[PDB]
Amino acid sequence: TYDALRRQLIPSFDLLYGSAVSVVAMSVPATARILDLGAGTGLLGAALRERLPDAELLLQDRSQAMLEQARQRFADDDQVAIRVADHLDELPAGPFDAVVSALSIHHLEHQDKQDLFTRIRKILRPGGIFVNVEQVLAPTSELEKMYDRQHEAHVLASDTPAEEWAAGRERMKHNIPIDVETQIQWLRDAGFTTADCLAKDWRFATYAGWNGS
Ligand SMILES: Nc1ncnc2c1ncn2[C@@H]1O[C@H](CSCC[C@H](N)C(=O)O)[C@@H](O)[C@H]1O
Ligand SMILES: [Ca+2]
């Protein structure tokens, strides 16, 4: 039900979450240590577990209520741990092969995003990968209205309950998005040697940075 609603609200959910899973699987070993930052109910972690049965997952979020859903999702999984922490708090030491995030980092001020990317690189192994599945701003107000129309078109085509879309729009008023190429450049500024946009559907994009390759 919850997973079905996320697909209704998020254009190209399968392409964008699937691209995050595929780029991690091509970048890290079967036995990778992975941090899911702002894991919420653990949706991105779950997609990774499906592909990587032998990976160690650490799910981190500031919300105990969201992580209770992650605890239920991963009830019988002996290779999943949960950490309660704000993005702004000290990150877990690691090292990690991958740090992943979906629809969470846009809740930080821009300066805090730039600093977070730098702090993430510090806990990555050499060659390690950072992946973000993210809500991104259009480069102009005119294109932002077109991004919004395309988002609405997906939500309508997906037969989304009107009250859930209204609730979704209200939550997005608190978001601090920026365009995908600005935050990809912030990965270069943070000292990632390669950064790329893997996949994109207007307002939603999957991008990654590599710590040495
Ligand atoms: N400053 C912050 N520090 C940590 N978690 C934060 C945060 N601001 C927002 N979050 C978390 O970010 C999540 C956004 S919803 C996305 C959840 C999950 N990654 C998914 O893909 O479905 C929520 O779980 C919320 O509690
Ligand atoms: Ca949000």
Numbering used by the authors: 17 to 229
What does the paper say about this structure?
Here, we characterize the O-methyltransferases BelI and CysG, which catalyze the initial step of β-lactone formation. Employing techniques such as crystallography, computational analysis, mutagenesis, and activity assays, we identified a His-His-Asp (HHD) motif in the active sites of the two enzymes, which is crucial for binding a catalytically active calcium ion. As expected, BelI as well as CysGΔN16 adopt the class I methyltransferase Rossmann fold, characterized by a core domain of a seven-stranded β-sheet flanked by α-helices. The HHD-motif enables regiospecific C1-carboxy group methylation of their respective malic substrates.
Due to the high crystallization tendency of CysGΔN16, subsequent mutagenesis experiments were focused on this variant. This approach enabled the production of both full-length and N-terminal truncated mutants in high purity, which were characterized in activity assays and used for structural studies. Conservative asparagine replacements in the HHD motif resulted in CysG variants that remained active. CysGfl-D191N showed a 56% decrease in substrate turnover, while CysGfl-H122N and CysGfl-H123N were fully active compared to wt but were inactivated with EDTA.
